[PDB]
């Protein structure tokens, strides 16, 4: 009996298949989150600066109140 | 001369009545840097409330 190297292909490994595809981001939907984070960013920040004004006037009031200084 | 004399009159009134909230508020302001009112507003609630009994 002769024994040589046997042939096997099975699945053929798929000859040239695309793996690159669009994922997560679509296009217009990313701008809704992108610019949406900006509008949420300013509104949250400016409310803190209005709360800073409560401290600001109260800080300068200490100088006016102190005349024996 | 009247300014410094009235200054002693202000601090003596706090030392006589409601001294416990005043000392606790004084320890809060010096433990931090120069926030003055930040991270000390919770201890500020103990203050003024005792003083509200007086005029």
UniProtKB/Swiss-Prot annotation, chain A:
GO molecular function: NADH dehydrogenase (ubiquinone) activity
Record keywords: Acetylation, Apoptosis, Electron transport, Membrane, Mitochondrion, Mitochondrion inner membrane, Nucleus, Respiratory chain, Transmembrane, Transmembrane helix, Transport
Transmembrane segments: 27-46
One Gene Ontology term, aspect cellular component: cytoplasm
Principal subcellular localization: mitochondrion
Compartmental location: Mitochondrion inner membrane; Nucleus
Coiled-coil ranges per UniProt: none
Gene Ontology annotations of biological process type: apoptotic process; negative regulation of DNA-templated transcription
Family affiliation: Belongs to the complex I NDUFA13 subunit family.
Subunit structure, interactors included: Complex I is composed of 45 different subunits. Interacts with CARD15, but not with CARD4. Interacts with STAT3, but not with STAT1, STAT2 and STAT5A. Interacts with OLFM4.
Function: Accessory subunit of the mitochondrial membrane respiratory chain NADH dehydrogenase (Complex I), that is believed not to be involved in catalysis. Complex I functions in the transfer of electrons from NADH to the respiratory chain. The immediate electron acceptor for the enzyme is believed to be ubiquinone. Involved in the interferon/all-trans-retinoic acid (IFN/RA) induced cell death. This apoptotic activity is inhibited by interaction with viral IRF1. Prevents the transactivation of STAT3 target genes.
Protein name, per record: NADH dehydrogenase [ubiquinone] 1 alpha subcomplex subunit 13
Source species: Bos taurus
Included stretch of the parent chain: 32 to 74 of 144
From Swiss-Prot, chain B:
Coiled coil: none
Keyword Repeat carried by entry: yes
Cellular localisation: Mitochondrion inner membrane; Mitochondrion intermembrane space; Mitochondrion
Motif Cx9C motif 3: positions: 18-28
Keyword tRNA-binding: no
Any one of the GO CC terms: mitochondrial intermembrane space
Chief localization: mitochondrion
Disulfide bridges in this chain: 18-50, 28-40
Motif Cx9C motif 4 boundaries: 40-50
GO biological process terms on file: mitochondrial electron transport, NADH to ubiquinone
Record domain CHCH: where: 15-54
Secretion signal, residue range per the UniProt entry: none
Keywords of the record: Disulfide bond, Electron transport, Membrane, Mitochondrion, Mitochondrion inner membrane, Repeat, Respiratory chain, Transport
Assembly with partners or alone: Complex I is composed of 45 different subunits.
Protein's job: Accessory subunit of the mitochondrial membrane respiratory chain NADH dehydrogenase (Complex I), that is believed not to be involved in catalysis. Complex I functions in the transfer of electrons from NADH to the respiratory chain. The immediate electron acceptor for the enzyme is believed to be ubiquinone.
Domain remarks: Contains four C-X9-C motifs that are predicted to form a helix-coil-helix structure, permitting the formation of intramolecular disulfide bonds.
Family: Belongs to the complex I NDUFA8 subunit family.
Protein name: NADH dehydrogenase [ubiquinone] 1 alpha subcomplex subunit 8
Organism per entry: Bos taurus (Bovine)
């Amino acid at each position: 009996x002769x024994x040589x190297x046997x042939x096997x292909x099975x699945x053929x490994x798929x000859x040239x298949x695309x793996x690159x595809x669009x994922x997560x981001x679509x296009g217009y939907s990313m701008f809704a989150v992108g610019i949406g984070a900006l509008l949420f960013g300013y509104w949250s920040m400016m409310k803190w600066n209005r709360e800073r004004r409560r401290l600001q006037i109260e800080d300068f009031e200490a100088r006016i109140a102190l005349m024996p200084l | 001369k009247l300014v410094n004399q009235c200054a002693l009159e202000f601090f003596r009134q706090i030392k006589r009545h409601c001294a416990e909230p005043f000392t606790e508020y004084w320890t809060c302001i010096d433990y931090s840097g120069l926030q003055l009112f930040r991270r000390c507003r919770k201890q500020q609630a103990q203050f003024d409330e005792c003083v509200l009994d007086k005029x």
